[PDB]
Design a protein around this ligand. Structure first.
Ligand SMILES: [Mg+2]
Ligand SMILES: [Mg+2]
Ligand SMILES: [Mg+2]
Ligand SMILES: [Mg+2]
Ligand SMILES: [Mg+2]
Ligand SMILES: [Mg+2]
Ligand SMILES: [Mg+2]
Ligand SMILES: [Mg+2]
Ligand SMILES: [Mg+2]
Ligand SMILES: [Mg+2]
Ligand SMILES: [Mg+2]
Ligand SMILES: [Mg+2]
Ligand SMILES: [Mg+2]
Ligand SMILES: [Mg+2]
Ligand SMILES: [Mg+2]
Ligand SMILES: [Mg+2]
Ligand SMILES: [Mg+2]
Ligand SMILES: [Mg+2]
Ligand SMILES: [Mg+2]
Ligand SMILES: [Zn+2]
Lengths: 98, 24, 125, 155, 127, 206, 60, 80
RNA sequence: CGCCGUUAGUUGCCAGCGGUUCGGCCGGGCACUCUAACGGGACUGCCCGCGAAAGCGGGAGGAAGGAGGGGACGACGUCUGGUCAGCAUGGCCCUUACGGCCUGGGCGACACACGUGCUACAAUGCCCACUACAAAGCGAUGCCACCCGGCAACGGGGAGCUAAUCGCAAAAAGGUGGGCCCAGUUCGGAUUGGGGUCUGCAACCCGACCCCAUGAAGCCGGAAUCGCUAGUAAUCGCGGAUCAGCCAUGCC
């Protein structure tokens, strides 16, 4: 176990989270279980377009939360000092629970 | 009909549970 | 037969039949049959004289039924009209009592519509 | 239909008689989009056709259908005055549908406690030229033409 | 030994596996005729077979999930015609003109605001 | 009553977000509030700098803030002065160790917000609305830009019956997502009520 | 609303059943999306300004 | 249909005021605004002035009235 | 959204082998389904016919063919259209009240009238039992498996989930069996009596749910009048926002 689930609001920016987090123990290091998609959760808000009456206009927003899996199988500690101390994207989060 | 609360389907409409529609 | 005081169901299933009695319906039929021991399915015609009895001596001497109900219920309401009680006024008046709306839709408690006029100029909408 | 002309939808043929004049009848028997109910009604009705006559149901069915479709109907029209019931032809695709419809409606007029029995007896009676449904057909055609006087709007 | 097609209809996805055999179909660990029990369609999911001569020349085991049995029926109807092309690919000559290889892309229409039911608009009063 | 927000419309493309972080449901609420609190301060004590957008990135307690100004003098102060007071003015309210990078706006008259304000500033001073606008556009056209448009609402010229003044040159392809069309709005509090000033600036396709 | 009435801020409300959201922004008491703390309009306005992260307009 | 299980609510502004008057004499008119308090045996005999939102009211309190609340006897709105 | 591909295997399965408490349950695979990223595909490109050209008609191949299906997107302007009560904001007005705090009442009144809806008037049906097949969502001051108490609402215990992994969750029409017999009924569930549960300081005015009794009008609706062109109408259930609770049959 080396739980590493990645979740933010942008999917371009969840490549700058799976690529370098694999390109470290990819062909030089260990193995890695590959970045696995994992279904996303969207939240819709349906605000009425105007203030005051006009019951029937509305406009839909959403807040998509995209995910990935990774999980670095066979963990040498050399990659770790390289993996745990190299980052890049701002609006991303990490979870780590072996 | 969906009106009678002492029916199965009257309780499915209400989204509730009781003697007339047990929760498994 | 004559299951409950001055009452007489016939020729349909027994459980449906006993519904024709005042303080009784399905719920009290399924019970007073299971407890009395008669198959709910048989037509009333096919009941042993012995069976009708075991039923009648139970149903009557175990529940407030017929007149004994619908006269005490009427007195159970006079009590509210006796004191000051809101529901009492609401019973006197002849309007809902379970805190419903009265601007539209009290038709069942009031009875048929007693229509009246409008004003002078106004929308006849 | 201001723009184009609209094509008749080609309905998928039957599962038991392979006929499209049947799913046609089966759709009209259907309500609230419960198609399984409809089939179970009709195919049952076919089983009652087979009982009360040695004839294949499919030739009995088609027989009543042909027997119901009108050759004339009326269609209101005006220039002034009032709505003049104008007699006119009944273009084949409509004979098809008027027949199917009336058949089902007529079927559900019957006193027969359940459907299928209703459908059977109505499907049967109509083959024999009797039974209301043919009422509509005849009382349509008879009521049309009886306005021959206004038939000078041929189209 | 094996032959395979997918097949889809209203997000309903069948998995079709053709095998040489006797005509005994099996959908989701069950007899074809006791999973589509009572549905007068069903027998319609095999129409690619009884129209290229197959049925009892072949056997079929099937994974199915998503939707309701009529979509599940049509998604099979497809999945078989596909596996049947993975066989003799000449099965198209008299198979495509009948439909079968098409994928009914008809899907449930989005519910839209200001209407009750996407298209059913709310009724009104005084025009 | 028409027309959506040319920024909000294009948000997925051409134009990105102003705040830039991630947060669970138990967080987003008061977190985002803070972001706005910082934007609110960053205009009261930062008006004359001429500020376009206040970016706000975030990691766990590394709240970025990246004030875009045209005149990064007034932001930084005399020596490094003003930007010391403000970095610790963002610390009084946000207890979450902030930065305050400042990226100058190369050509202020190519960023709609700024343009929009210059026009609003002119009018608050009593001025030639109908002229000011045509001026404001020409500036955005002499500064490049494949097109531009500016709108002042009503009570023009301190009038009586609210109007709407126009002026627009080049292309302003409001319906296309492959756009890139800055949009800024300035209020114009006058002696006799407010006047809305919208500015649009089209600058290139893909 | 009335600046006085802005006192859900009033920490102790005697009993929670008097506690009631308002829009942190405009003070509205009547369409306050829990997630945001914003009301109907403030929500839409800020969304379009692009000031609340990861929120696009939804199309499906 | 009733409703209160256990803890048969009776507001306490007058719960002791009613039994502090059961140490001597039944004082005439002991007004409240708690039209929400259930009547309880120690209340029998007295006379409570219940508010309307407008007026207090002479509610002579008998024996039949017990399960009820005072508000049931102090009618609010007024009719044709 | 519809077909196909590459990337990715704590979701996937007689694809294919081993064990079985026969539960993908385990070893184990990534083929398939799926999840979510990046691509390919479609353009009157090919064919026959009319046309000066655009284009029109049919045919082929294809998952799809002429805008393949549904969104988002609202021109210069118009109604001196709506909103000073979301928010700003000019002017006007009140300043021991036109401001402020409370407790209580009212916004829920009822001779009447209309709008939008819900449940019906039933056999293509209602009831009960058993047995299938979804999508989209939500969830630790939470969702609540599971075991007891209770006719039940629910109460007391208590596992797993910070969620493709646990729970809400039962989908319901459907299918199989059984009942009902044309009846104001085993249709319909209004009304009222009674006893309870729950949330909240507090349910009289004025909450929802449970159980028992009651079992009203309603046999398809005058003149008028609304919606819908295809996965549409029709019908069947499922979820979410608001929110302690809830008057939701509303909305999305
Ligand atoms: Mg619109
Ligand atoms: Mg019933
Ligand atoms: Mg639907
Ligand atoms: Mg104010
Ligand atoms: Mg509240
Ligand atoms: Mg084995
Ligand atoms: Mg795929
Ligand atoms: Mg050409
Ligand atoms: Mg367009
Ligand atoms: Mg007005
Ligand atoms: Mg008050
Ligand atoms: Mg109101
Ligand atoms: Mg009206
Ligand atoms: Mg139990
Ligand atoms: Mg039966
Ligand atoms: Mg009708
Ligand atoms: Mg149309
Ligand atoms: Mg709720
Ligand atoms: Mg609801
Ligand atoms: Zn607000």
């Amino acid at each position: 176990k080396i739980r590493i689930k990645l979740r933010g609001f942008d999917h371009k920016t969840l490549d700058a989270s799976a690529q370098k987090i694999v390109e470290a123990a990819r062909r030089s290091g260990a193995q890695v279980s590959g970045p696995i998609p994992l279904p996303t959760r969207v939240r819709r808000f349906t605000v009425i377009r105007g203030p005051f009456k006009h019951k029937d206009s509305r406009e839909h927003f959403e807040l998509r939360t995209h995910n990935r899996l990774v999980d670095i199988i066979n963990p040498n500690r050399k990659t770790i000092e390289q993996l745990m101390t190299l980052d890049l994207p701002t609006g991303v989060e990490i979870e780590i629970k072996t | 009909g969906k009106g009678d609360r002492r029916t199965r389907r009257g309780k499915i409409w209400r989204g509730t549970y009781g003697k007339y529609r047990p929760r498994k | 037969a004559r299951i409950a005081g001055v009452e007489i169901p016939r020729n349909k299933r027994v459980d449906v039949a006993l519904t024709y009695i005042y303080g009784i319906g399905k719920a009290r039929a399924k019970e007073a049959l299971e407890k009395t021991g008669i198959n709910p399915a048989t037509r009333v015609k096919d009941l042993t004289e012995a069976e009708v009895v075991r039923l009648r001596e139970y149903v009557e001497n175990t529940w407030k039924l017929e007149g004994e109900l619908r006269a005490e219920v009427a007195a159970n309401i006079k009590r509210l009209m006796d004191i000051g009680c809101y529901r009492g006024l609401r019973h006197r008046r002849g309007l809902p009592v379970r805190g419903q709306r009265t601007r539209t839709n009290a038709r069942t408690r009031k009875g048929p519509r007693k229509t009246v006029a409008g004003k002078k100029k106004a929308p006849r909408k | 239909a201001r723009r184009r002309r609209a094509e008749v939808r080609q309905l998928q043929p039957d599962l038991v008689y392979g006929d499209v004049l049947v799913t046609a009848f089966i759709n009209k028997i259907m309500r609230d989009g419960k198609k399984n109910l409809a089939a179970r009604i009709f195919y049952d009705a076919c089983k009652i056709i087979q009982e009360k006559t040695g004839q294949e149901p499919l030739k009995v069915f088609k027989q009543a259908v042909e027997n119901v479709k009108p050759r004339m109907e009326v269609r209101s029209r005006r220039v002034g005055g009032a709505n003049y019931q104008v007699p006119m032809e009944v273009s084949p695709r409509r004979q098809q549908s008027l027949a199917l419809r009336w058949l089902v409606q007529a079927a559900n007029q019957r006193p027969e406690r359940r459907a299928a029995v209703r459908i059977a007896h109505e499907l049967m009676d109509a083959a024999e030229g009797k039974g209301g449904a043919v009422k509509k057909k005849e009382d349509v055609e008879r009521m049309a033409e009886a306005n021959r006087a206004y038939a000078h709007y041929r189209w | 030994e094996q032959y395979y097609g997918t097949g889809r209809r209203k997000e309903a996805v069948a998995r079709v596996f053709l095998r040489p055999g006797n005509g005994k179909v099996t959908v989701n660990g069950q007899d074809f005729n006791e999973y589509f029990q009572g549905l007068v369609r069903a027998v319609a999911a095999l129409e690619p077979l009884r129209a290229v001569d197959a049925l009892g020349r072949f056997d079929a085991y099937i994974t199915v999930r998503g939707g309701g049995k009529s979509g599940q029926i049509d998604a099979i109807k497809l999945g078989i015609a596909r596996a049947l092309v993975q066989y003799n690919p000449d099965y198209r000559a008299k198979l495509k003109p009948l439909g079968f290889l098409t994928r009914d892309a008809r899907v449930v229409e989005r519910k839209k605001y200001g209407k009750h039911k996407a298209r059913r608009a709310p009724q009104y009063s005084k025009r | 009553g028409n027309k959506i927000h040319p920024i909000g419309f294009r948000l997925g493309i051409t134009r990105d977000w102003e705040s830039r972080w991630y947060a669970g449901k138990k967080q987003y609420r008061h977190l985002l509030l803070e972001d706005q609190r910082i934007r609110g301060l960053l205009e009261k004590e930062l008006y004359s700098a001429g500020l376009a957008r206040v970016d706000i990135e975030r990691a766990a307690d590394n709240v970025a803030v990246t004030v875009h100004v045209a005149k990064p003098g007034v932001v930084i102060g005399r020596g490094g002065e003003r930007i010391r007071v403000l970095r610790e003015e963002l610390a009084k309210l946000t207890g979450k160790n902030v930065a305050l990078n400042v990226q100058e706006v190369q050509n202020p008259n190519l960023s709609a917000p700024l343009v929009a304000q210059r026009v609003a500033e002119q009018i608050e001073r009593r001025f030639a609305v109908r002229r000011a606008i045509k001026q404001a556009v020409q500036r955005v056209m002499e500064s490049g830009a494949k097109g531009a448009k500016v709108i002042v609402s009503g009570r023009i010229g301190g009038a009586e019956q609210a109007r709407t003044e126009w002026a627009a040159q080049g292309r302003v392809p409001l319906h296309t997502l492959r756009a890139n069309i800055d949009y800024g709005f300035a209020l114009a509090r006058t002696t006799y009520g407010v006047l809305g000033v919208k500015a649009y600036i089209f600058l290139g396709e893909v | 609303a009335r600046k006085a009435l802005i006192e859900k801020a009033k920490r102790t409300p005697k009993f929670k059943v008097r506690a009631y959201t308002r829009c942190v922004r405009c003070g509205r008491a009547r369409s306050v999306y829990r997630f945001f703390g914003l009301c109907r309009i403030c929500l839409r306005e800020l969304a379009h300004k692009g000031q609340l992260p990861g929120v696009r307009k939804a199309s499906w | 249909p009733r409703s209160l299980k256990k803890g048969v609510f009776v507001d306490d502004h007058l719960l002791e005021k009613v039994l502090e008057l059961n140490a001597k004499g039944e004082k005439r008119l002991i007004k409240t605004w708690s039209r929400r308090s259930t009547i309880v045996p120690e209340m029998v005999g007295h006379t409570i002035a219940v508010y309307n939102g407008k007026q207090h009211v002479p509610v002579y309190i008998t024996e039949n009235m017990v399960g009820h609340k005072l508000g049931e006897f102090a009618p609010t709105r007024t009719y044709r």
